């Protein structure tokens, strides 16, 4: 009748046990990298977790075991979840890679992801100096 499957909870975005810092690179990742991607025409499918129930994608979380999205990344930055800039960059990379696993090369959503990823890589090439 209907596929049987719930969404997982979204990724964790805060953790009181983790120490917190602000750094040049983390500030850039929020104010330049995330900001630039978030405002893009094609950001919207990537601004929140994939809702497999609403989108009728019952196999999505059968294969995507490390989901990630820009809404999560934004909250993690805002909550000082990341200590090292590379932890945030890795989350963006996971987001893109997940899209390229679940969706066929050349599909609409993949072309959208590629346009965002190009802009991401350009901004990462201009990452500022560390402390």
Ligand X SMILES: COc1cc2c(cc1-c1c(C)noc1C)ncc1nc(C)n([C@H](C)c3ccccc3)c12
User: Given candidates 28, 46, 82, 120, which one binds ligand X under the rule CB under 6 A?
Assistant: 46
Dihedral pair phi/psi, residue 90, rounded to 5°: -60, -40
CB of 93 to ligand X, least distance (A): 14
Residues numbered 72-111 forming contacts with ligand X, rule: CB under 6 A: 99, 102-103, 108-109
CB of 106 to ligand X, least distance (A): 12
Q: Is 70 in the site for ligand X (CB under 6 A)?
A: no
Residue (53 or 109) nearer to ligand X, CB: 109
Residue (28 or 46) nearer to ligand X, CB: 46
Which residues in this chain contact ligand X in the complex, by CB under 6 A?
A: 45-46, 50, 55, 57, 99, 102-103, 108-109
């Amino acid at each position: 009748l209907v596929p049987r499957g719930s969404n997982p909870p979204p990724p964790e975005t805060s953790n009181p046990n983790k120490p917190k810092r602000q750094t040049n690179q983390l500030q850039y990742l929020l104010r330049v990298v995330l900001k630039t991607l978030w405002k893009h025409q094609f950001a919207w499918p990537f601004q929140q977790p994939v809702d497999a129930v609403k989108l009728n994608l019952p196999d999505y979380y059968k294969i995507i075991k490390t989901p990630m999205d820009m809404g999560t990344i934004k909250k993690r930055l805002e909550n000082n979840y990341y200590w090292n800039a590379q932890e945030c960059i890795q989350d963006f990379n996971t987001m893109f890679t997940n899209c390229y696993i679940y969706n066929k090369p050349g599909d609409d959503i993949v072309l959208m992801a590629e346009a965002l990823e190009k802009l991401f890589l350009q901004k990462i090439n201009e990452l500022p100096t560390e402390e």
